[PDB]
Write a protein that binds this DNA or RNA. Sequence first.
DNA 1: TCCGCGGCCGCCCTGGAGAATCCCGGTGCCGAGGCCGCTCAATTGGTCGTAGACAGCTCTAGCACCGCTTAAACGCACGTACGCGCTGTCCCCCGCG
DNA 2: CGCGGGGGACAGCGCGTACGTGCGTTTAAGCGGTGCTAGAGCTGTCTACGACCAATTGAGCGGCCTCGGCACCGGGATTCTCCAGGGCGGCCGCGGA
Lengths: 70, 97, 82
Amino acid sequence: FRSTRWQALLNFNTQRRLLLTGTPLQNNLAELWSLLYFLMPQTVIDGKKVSGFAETKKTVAKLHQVLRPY
Amino acid sequence: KPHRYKPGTVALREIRRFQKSTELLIRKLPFQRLVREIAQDFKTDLRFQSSAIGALQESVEAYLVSLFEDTNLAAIHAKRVTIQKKEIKLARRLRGE
Amino acid sequence: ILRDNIQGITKPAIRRLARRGGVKRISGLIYEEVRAVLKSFLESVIRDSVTYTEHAKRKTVTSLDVVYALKRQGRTLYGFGG
DNA sequence: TCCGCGGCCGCCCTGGAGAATCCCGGTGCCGAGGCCGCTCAATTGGTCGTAGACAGCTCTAGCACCGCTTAAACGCACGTACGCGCTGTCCCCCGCG
DNA sequence: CGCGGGGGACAGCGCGTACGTGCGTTTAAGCGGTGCTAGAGCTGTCTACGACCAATTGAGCGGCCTCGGCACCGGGATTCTCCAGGGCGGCCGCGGA
């Protein structure tokens, strides 16, 4: 989040975005939310409402059940 | 043939540029290293803030630029154009320093 | 940071500074002699600055401290803390 | 001695070329100044004082001149020797990778 | 940090004249005197003329946030300058009758 390119490449005059990665990290929902903002900036910064509060199997199932469309 | 400019040709547009532009011309981190190394002798382990450093470099830059202009005036007075040690010492002495 | 940083004002830096004075050629021994002149001026300013800092019961040196240090030079024109 | 001509051919003028110009816009960004609180010493009033020029003597030396007596200036004539002109030398940092 | 080199720093010697130094003879100041009077100046004075806190007060500020401007290249002949042929400053030399 604190990176310079986080703000550098988030304000381009481009109508479409494409992101390629090897494999996103399973834990540390911070970078998952960061990528969610990278694809397009609409999601709220509060990632603790969906998960991160309360178990691992349910947490990962909910994590996979919210990023399915993209 | 390569477009090798004669010495003193680029200087025209160069002085056109840097007379209008008003940015710095000295590396910052070596300068703060210098001011530290001169400060510890007077007072060790000084807790330097972000300020009190740019003012010193600006002041010394203005003083040395004035001295260099005076030295250029002395060199032109010496029926020449280049700088030398004697021009600098004469300009400094006539400045009261 | 504390060892041989007098070369911070480099030879290309001195050449660029002399460019602002209006000179075409800068001799080889110009760089170190103007380095010594800068060292002398900086030492003269900072001696007064640190003495004022000791007088003011202060451990840190502020910009206004060197402003007063240069004040008794006798010009005192515009600048921060003027 | 005329001068025909031929040569050393290389230099300002001309044409071609290299990089920048400082605005027209795009995109993105950037902290002045008025506005809910405020606060706080300013602005008159009354008292306090006080000293600092209005006279007034005062006092003391400025000054312009009258009348001698020199002192460097001034012109001139020659000396000379060193800045300057002219020219030659070398040099080492600027432009570029 | 490295190299080509070329305009520029630095010197050798002639010019000659431009001060510099040695001749007389001044123009105006220094000194002795002076007779005054004209400016510089503190004392009775007394008044007006400055300072400071009560009731109010306004006025500029303490803090945020919009938005018309900052920064400079897409966009680029001309400016700025540099470098290769042409006609030429002509220069000059040498030789039949």
